[model samples]
Target chain A: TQKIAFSATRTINVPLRRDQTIRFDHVITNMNNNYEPRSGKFTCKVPGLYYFTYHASSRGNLCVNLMRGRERAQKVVTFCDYAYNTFQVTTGGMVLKLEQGENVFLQATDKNSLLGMEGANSIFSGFLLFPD
Target chain B: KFQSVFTVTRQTHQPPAPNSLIRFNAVLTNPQGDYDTSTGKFTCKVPGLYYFVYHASHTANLCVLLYRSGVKVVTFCGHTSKTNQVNSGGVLLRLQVGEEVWLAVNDYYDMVGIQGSDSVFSGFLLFPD
Candidate 1:
């Protein structure tokens, strides 16, 4: 269902391959509608505290890094050792202060990490909690 | 409309009595006074999407829930078997103005909780109506 009262939001409904940046993937909710769903990278516009998390499933091993520009903040790892097709999900988020024009996105340390999804489970979401 | 955003908790390292309302001795932020430590409840001031979360460090089976008036919003569960576990849960809801929210012990568990950032109940306005 489409959510009301939400602007500058995005959700991914499909698997995303290793990319230079996060693509909109499935482009769930883009406020301006011109919002980037595939680029994967979300640039700060309002500048304040924001909450962000990337939840996804991957087989073998996958390390999801929460990035602020070139700096890495947190890493959430999901692994399935004995199973081939079985995928485990890992999610982590940060509530941090940010400034306008700062960039944020999820990056995989393992290039082979495939962000797969059964539904809209695999997603990258964040919003300005409050303005500075 | 007034803005609603806050982070609050008590300084006591021990858990409050089971079934008792959680008291917050501190306030990290409360711009709108939506959260009241005296009553241990957050009164929604703006109707829209809000995100709430709570976390705790525990050594025994512990459970806490987010209660929005009569509705159970989310539950955080942990077991001492895990050895000093961190249990937390959160939800984003489209709440209505005056619909209060608070954290409470689940069922009747005199669960484990502690001071510092690991154990807390906080919420903020995500999008205003």
Candidate 2:
């Protein structure tokens, strides 16, 4: 009963403004239902150490930050990808300690980037490392 | 039931060559001894789904591929115009016992292994099958 993990991907191409959350609509795996697609946030049900990671495909540029805390929204890690005129992928990962009811999600920093299609996909995933 | 996890950083100070394995000599955590630093490969001892990820800091163009038993699963690219950048990618894979996983350099290996920057690769067992 220690299964707590989720992996989501963005398939629809949408323009994300600054400070807006990237809603990963496609769910590859959501064990224990910890991730919510509606809010694009993962609510911690168990306090523990967790590893969160993301990979984004972009044509020009992309800047994304992993924000923690639902109320204050602190930046845990930021990843940026800059391509001169071609497609590229950027990624980041972080290990964090979470309390119950804490929230975590990806937010865009700049403008029109992030490729979401059949060939190019943006992914976000997190899993519980150890329950506290 | 079995549990395995590891996080490794670049072994040497120099950048790796094209189409070669970048052996991460420094280990952050490897409780299960599934990842081998000498061979730069993670051999599966537990049959289950595993989450693998890597991030690298480089100055110029770099292409890193995550390979599963000689087959490319995913590729991550980092292109720099006038500044240094960090690139990363990851995937979830189900492995049978004895399967191998590792990261390799592609043809675009110029300006890699920048000083003062760190590159790391990590993996952990999600659940045993």
Candidate 3:
């Protein structure tokens, strides 16, 4: 099992306009034959109702889900029967009236292993939006 | 009296022949299809240095060649054995405003052409103020 770690971080500009969108994406890979999953946490720097989306994929499946705090907003699933295949997942609009230092993150479920396989990879990406 | 912005999406998957070439042409038109292809000639409208770029990648190995007004300007050859041969190249030259820019592959493979799935290539007009 190979443990590969990849992270993406950004500091948004201040005085953000209402109903604006912010986006970030990154690619992570594991060289070993393990199928471990990856996860991370993010903090919102401003106060407003924000929308969030989490997208993740593995060698054989693609999963996308939306969340607003602890509540699940939306979910999507795709299946692939082969290995070394690539999938893309996308979710949108998880509303949160955040403060100056609100925190949010993505975590891998226990049913899904965090270990990655040889030449197999995963990606982490999401975007945020405010209501007009 | 003509003030409008239009968007065009051009998708091609035909690879070139080895030691030969394949050209991709676009006939820009308005709502009435009154676009004048002659207005985009190689050495007519404006005269100055210009730049163009071509990018492509596929599971097979290939080379990218660029031409302007029927003249060769640049060539990009692959040097890696990776299954994903993502390569890009460009050319800079003095061209007329109406000059035409074209791109082609030097090798022929049904699946090894310009796949604009995860990427995009665009042409621009630049001038000094």
Q: Top lDDT: which candidate number?
A: 2
For model 3, how does the per-residue alpha-carbon lDDT over A1-132 read when each residue is reduced to its tens digit?
111112232121222222222222222221221112322334444345543333222224322222223332222222222213332211222445655444444432222321122211122322223322
Q: What is the full ranking by TM-score, best candidate first?
A: 2, 1, 3
lDDT tens string, model 3, B14-71? 5445655443334332342222233322232434333343445555554455567686
Report lDDT (CA) for all predictions. 0.57, 0.81, 0.34
Ten-residue segment with the worst summed lDDT in candidate 1 chain A? A1-10
* Stretches of model 1 off by over 4 angstroms after superposition: A1-51, A54-91, A94-132, B81-83, B107-118
**Model 1 lDDT tens row, A1-132:** 222211222244444454334443554334322235556666666667776654443444555556675344333333221214433334477776877667676665543444433321345556665677
Candidate order by decreasing lDDT = 2, 1, 3
* Alpha carbon RMSD to native, model 3: 15.1
Judge the docking of candidate 2 as incorrect, acceptable, medium or high: acceptable
Model 2 interface DockQ: 0.28
Q: Which candidate is the best by TM-score?
A: 2
* lDDT per residue as tens, model 2, A1-132: 577888777876678989998898888668788999777899999999998888887889778888999478898877775776866776778899999889999998874588866545677889888999
